């Protein structure tokens, strides 16, 4: 009966530290995930405003090379 | 000779402590711990219960133990608060929220060793130790989870001496949550193997007696307590002062228990009080065999009597008394079973409880007490099918499989009393 007594409180340590453990590392995945994504929107936002300094180049020098 | 105390949680507790009230008084021990006395039969077994400090103090040999100090503030608080030795009070801040694995194995264990330390102690300076009786309920956390926590650890230190305990079983009538039922088979499966006599004081049959009988349309916790004190002063009456028979726990126990797991008792009073009319010893003995004085619900016409002790208490005919337990056992033979013969057992002793010019207690080994085993059996079913509540127990490390066990165990017993009243 001692040794049973001893495997239930350990059953419940080791539960409730499995249970923070999950939890910390499900918190850290999602946010870097969430991290990783609003940077990818973002600099794809940032490219395509690129995209149009480079084409107003374009344009002023298709003005230049027409005259 | 000496008998250790101990009591648990808030039943328990309240219990216990109403208990060394009543039997101070009947011994001439006041508040203070001083003998004002009338009569040397008071003082010629009082070291059974009460230690001797300087200054001629009696000191009760009682431990009070719980996982929460309030109902142990308010026993220190109480009418007999000051009575008890300091260092036997032993409690934690946590609680068990009626929860039996919190009592048995989470909070109850880091408890337990320090309630260890103080039984040793009073042990210890026993001149020959009878063993122990416990005072709590089996509906609730601490007094039924980490109460049969100590009834093993007890064992496994004095496994020579015996065990008796005063278990207060649940009721959804007088009920605080749920899962009673739960937490009374899990404590009843530990009895039946550690305890050698157990008073199954029910909760159910304490309320219907004050309703029915008393006439108190709203009975309280107190009202419930003032049957059980009754009872527990002449259950230990024997034990107490003077006398011939069931004089220990041992000689109880071997008069009583003819059957190693069935022995659990199914007390009784008469008078039923909350009155100045003298009860004659007819009167008592009829109404003390009368299902309406039984302290377990159970009907004792739907099974029979391996063993019975009977106490009559106050001035009366010893012949009397003789011839009316005589007439009921005659009358009634078929209640008695036939292999065992002569299984009634009777005491008288003079001095009377307070209040009463009379009394009697009696003390029933029934096969009929297995209906109290199943009505707790079909509430734990019920719950347990769906296994509802069960997360309050798993999250403190337990399987599904120590319910299943326990639930088996008790369906066992009943099956058991089963056997013996067909016989
Ligand atoms: N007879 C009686 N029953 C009680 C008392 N207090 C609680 N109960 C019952 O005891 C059970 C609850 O356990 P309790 O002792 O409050 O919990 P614990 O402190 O964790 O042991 C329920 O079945 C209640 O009906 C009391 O003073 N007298
Ligand atoms: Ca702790
Ligand atoms: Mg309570």
């Given at each position: 009966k001692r040794e049973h007594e001893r495997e239930v409180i350990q059953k419940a340590i080791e539960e409730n530290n499995n249970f923070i453990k999950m939890a910390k590392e499900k918190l850290a995945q999602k946010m870097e995930s969430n991290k990783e994504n609003r940077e990818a929107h973002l600099a794809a936002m940032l490219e395509r405003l690129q995209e149009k300094d480079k084409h107003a180049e374009e344009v002023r020098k298709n003005k230049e090379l027409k005259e | 000779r000496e008998i250790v105390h101990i009591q648990a949680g808030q039943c328990?507790?309240?219990?216990?402590?109403?208990?060394?009230?009543?039997?101070?008084?009947?011994?001439?021990?006041?508040?203070?711990?001083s003998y004002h006395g009338d009569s040397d039969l008071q003082l010629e077994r009082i070291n059974v219960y009460?230690?001797?400090?300087?200054?001629?103090?009696?000191?009760?040999?009682?431990?009070?133990?719980?996982?929460?100090?309030?109902?142990?503030?308010?026993?220190?608080?109480?009418?007999?608060?000051?009575?008890?030795?300091?260092?036997?009070?032993?409690?934690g801040q946590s609680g068990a929220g009626n929860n039996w694995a919190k009592g048995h194995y989470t909070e109850g264990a880091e408890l337990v060793d320090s309630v260890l330390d103080v039984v040793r102690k009073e042990s210890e300076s026993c001149?020959?130790?009878?063993?122990?009786?416990?005072?709590?309920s089996l509906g609730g956390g601490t007094g039924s989870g980490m109460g049969t926590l100590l009834?093993?650890?007890?064992?496994?230190?004095?496994?020579?001496?015996?065990?008796?305990?005063?278990?207060?079983?649940?009721?959804?009538?007088?009920?605080?949550?749920?899962?009673?039922?739960?937490?009374?088979?899990?404590?009843?499966?530990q009895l039946?193997?550690?305890?050698?006599?157990?008073?199954?004081?029910?909760?159910?049959?304490?309320?219907?007696?004050?309703?029915?009988?008393?006439?108190?349309?709203?009975?309280?916790?107190?009202?419930?307590?003032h049957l059980v004190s009754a009872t527990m002063s002449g259950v230990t009456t024997c034990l107490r002062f003077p006398g011939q028979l069931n004089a220990d726990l041992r000689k109880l126990a071997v008069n009583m228990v003819p059957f190693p797991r069935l022995h659990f008792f199914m007390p009784g009073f008469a008078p039923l009080t909350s009155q100045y009319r003298a009860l004659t010893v007819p009167e008592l003995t009829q109404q003390m065999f009368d299902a309406?004085?039984?302290?377990?619900?159970?009907?004792?016409?739907?099974?029979?009597?391996?063993?019975?002790?009977?106490?009559?208490?106050?001035?009366?005919?010893?012949?009397?008394?003789?011839?009316?337990?005589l007439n009921v056992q005659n009358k009634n033979?078929?209640?008695?079973?036939?292999?065992?013969?002569?299984?009634?057992?009777?005491?008288?002793?003079?001095?009377?409880?307070?209040?009463?010019?009379?009394?009697?207690?009696?003390?029933?080994?029934?096969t009929?007490?297995?209906?109290?085993?199943?009505?707790?059996?079909?509430?734990?079913?019920?719950?347990?099918?769906?296994?509802?509540?069960?997360?309050?127990?798993?999250?403190?490390?337990?399987?599904?499989?120590?319910?299943?066990?326990?639930?088996?165990?008790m369906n066992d017993l009943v099956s058991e009393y089963q056997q013996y009243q067909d016989a």
């Open positions: - | 328990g507790n309240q219990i216990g402590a109403k208990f060394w009230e009543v039997i101070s008084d009947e011994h001439g021990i006041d508040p203070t711990g009460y230690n001797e400090a300087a200054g001629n103090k009696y000191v009760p040999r009682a431990i009070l133990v719980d996982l929460e100090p309030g109902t142990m503030d308010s026993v220190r608080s109480g009418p007999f608060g000051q009575i008890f030795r300091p260092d036997n009070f032993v409690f001149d020959c130790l009878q063993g122990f009786q416990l005072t709590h009834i093993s650890k007890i064992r496994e230190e004095y496994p020579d001496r015996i065990m008796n305990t005063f278990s207060v079983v649940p009721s959804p009538k007088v009920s605080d949550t749920v899962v009673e039922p739960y937490n009374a088979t899990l404590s009843v499966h039946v193997e550690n305890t050698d006599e157990t008073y199954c004081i029910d909760n159910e049959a304490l309320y219907d007696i004050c309703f029915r009988t008393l006439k108190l349309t709203t009975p309280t916790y107190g009202d419930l307590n309406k004085n039984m302290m377990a619900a159970c009907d004792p016409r739907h099974g029979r009597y391996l063993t019975v002790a009977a106490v009559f208490r106050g001035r009366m005919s010893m012949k009397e008394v003789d011839e009316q337990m033979s078929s209640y008695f079973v036939e292999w065992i013969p002569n299984n009634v057992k009777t005491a008288v002793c003079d001095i009377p409880p307070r209040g009463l010019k009379m009394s009697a207690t009696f003390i029933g080994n029934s009929a007490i297995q209906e109290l085993f199943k009505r707790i059996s079909e509430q734990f079913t019920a719950m347990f099918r769906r296994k509802a509540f069960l997360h309050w127990y798993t999250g403190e490390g337990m399987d599904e499989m120590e319910f299943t066990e326990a639930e088996s165990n």
